[PDB]
Amino acid sequence: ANLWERFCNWVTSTDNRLYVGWFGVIMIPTLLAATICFVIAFIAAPPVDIDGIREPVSGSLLYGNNIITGAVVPSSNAIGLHFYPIWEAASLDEWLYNGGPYQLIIFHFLLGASCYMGRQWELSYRLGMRPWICVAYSAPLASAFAVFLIYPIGQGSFSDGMPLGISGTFNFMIVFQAEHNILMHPFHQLGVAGVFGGALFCAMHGSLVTSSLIRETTETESANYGYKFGQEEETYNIVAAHGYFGRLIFQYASFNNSRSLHFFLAAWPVVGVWFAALGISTMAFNLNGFNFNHSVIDAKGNVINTWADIINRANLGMEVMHERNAHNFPLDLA
C-alpha cells in the first residue's frame, strides 16, 4: 500500500474512536475554527457596532456581561452582506469593532455542520446501515441556515442574523415578531406542532415502553439492569403496551407495528421543524404571517377589534422601540 492509499484507509477507518471520513476532513478544521473564535470572543471581545450607527453593543463577559446577557454580536449594518475576513480589515481592532468574529464563526460553523450531516451519511454507509439519519438532522441544520444565512440574505445584512447568545436570541425573536408577525404564520404554527408534538410523543413512547418492561429484576435494583447490551430478545412487551394504549383511546388509534411507530416518531418533529425552518426562510423574503388587522367592521364601519388587533398593538410596541436610533425615515423596509 502506498501513502495515499494508507491515508485513505485511515480516514475512512471504522476503527477510529471517532470516525473521521472525508466529510470529517472538512468538518474538523472548520468546527475547531468556529469553536475557538467563539469562546475567545464570548469572553474577551470588545463591543461591536451591530447596526452600523456607531453605537457599539457589549457582548463579552469581560465587558460587563453574564452568561444570560452575553453574546457574539452580529457584524455591522454598514457591512451588509459584504464578505469581511480578517485580511479585509486594516487592523484586528477595526475587525473587532465591526463584528468580524460573527462572520468567521457562522461561516465556519455552517460549513462544519453541513459536513456533520454528510458524515452521518458516510458512517452509515461504512457500517452497512440504512442511510437516512442525516435526513432527520437536515431539519435542525436547515433551521440554523435560516437564522444565520438565509434571513440575512433576504434582509440584506448579517446584522439581522441571529446573535450568538441567549438574550440575543430573545432580541432576534421579538424583532422577528414585530416585522413578520411570525406567530400568525402557518409554518411557525406547524413548527410548534412539530416540537410540542415531538415532546408529547417522546414522553408517550417513553412511558409506554417503560410501563411495559418485562420483569427481570428485584425491587432493590434498577429495572435498567434487566436489559443487557446486545441481547437478542426485546426488553418489553409491545402487545401489552398496545393493549393498554389501545384501550386508552381506541384500538385502531394505537400502533402495533414497532417500525411504523418509530417511523412516525422520526417523521413528526422532522417534518414540523422543516416547516419551521421554511417559515423563517420565506419570511426572509417578507412573505409574512396573516394580517387580520381591522378585518372585522360593523354596519356603520367602526372597527371591531379581535385578538389579532391586540396582537397588532403589542407588535407595534416592538416595532417603534426596536433599534431606537437606526431609522431616519418612516417605514422600516428592511
Binding site: 388587522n293 381591522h294 356603520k300 364601519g301 367602526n302 372597527v303 388587533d309 397588532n312 398593538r313 407595534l316 416595532e319 417603534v320
Partner: peptide, 17 residues
C-alpha cells in the same frame, strides 16, 4: 365620509391602529 366614521383613526397613523 371616512373621518365621520373612524374619527381619530383616519389620518392618525399607527398610534390609532
Amino acid at each position: 365620509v371616512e373621518p365621520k366614521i373612524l374619527g381619530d383613526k383616519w389620518g392618525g397613523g399607527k398610534v390609532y391602529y
